[PDB]
Design a protein around this ligand. Structure first.
Ligand SMILES: *C(=O)C[C@@H]1O[C@@H](C)[C@@H](O)[C@@H](O)[C@@H]1O
Ligand SMILES: [Ca+2]
Ligand SMILES: [Ca+2]
Ligand SMILES: [Ca+2]
Length: 114
């Protein structure tokens, strides 16, 4: 199944934050309406924040997260969780190698803001 694609409400500010837990440098691409809107690049094995940014979901509300390591797309897992019908988390994990901890790049999208 497709992973890392989320339908957000339209024209809504959302936060996107990425953490690294891998030997390889992580490149995190965030697309709004199929256009790249933010790129994070960093390396860490201590869950360091390699990027955090506020974006607008625009008129489509389609947000897609992609992760690339060693020039190879990482395998992704994702889901969306909603608390008390108001607070939204779109979550991505990604695996760049063989150990399947799926934490190599971890991406958290949360909304609403403000
Ligand atoms: C290469 O070593 C694989 C890679 O980096 C490791 C330190 C570990 O974080 C592993 O999960 C990651 O895929
Ligand atoms: Ca891994
Ligand atoms: Ca890892
Ligand atoms: Ca508030």
């Amino acid at each position: 199944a497709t992973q890392g694609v989320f339908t957000l409400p339209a024209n809504t500010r959302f936060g996107v934050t990425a953490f690294a837990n891998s030997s390889g440098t992580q490149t995190v691409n965030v697309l709004v309406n199929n256009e790249t809107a933010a790129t994070f690049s960093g390396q860490s094995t201590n869950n360091a924040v390699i990027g955090t940014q506020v974006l607008n979901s625009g008129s489509s509300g389609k947000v897609q997260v992609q992760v690339s390591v060693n020039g190879r797309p990482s395998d992704l897992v994702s889901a969306q969780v909603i608390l008390t019908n108001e607070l939204n988390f779109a979550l991505v994990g990604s695996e760049d190698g063989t150990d399947n901890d799926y934490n190599d790049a971890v991406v958290v999208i949360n909304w609403p803001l403000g």
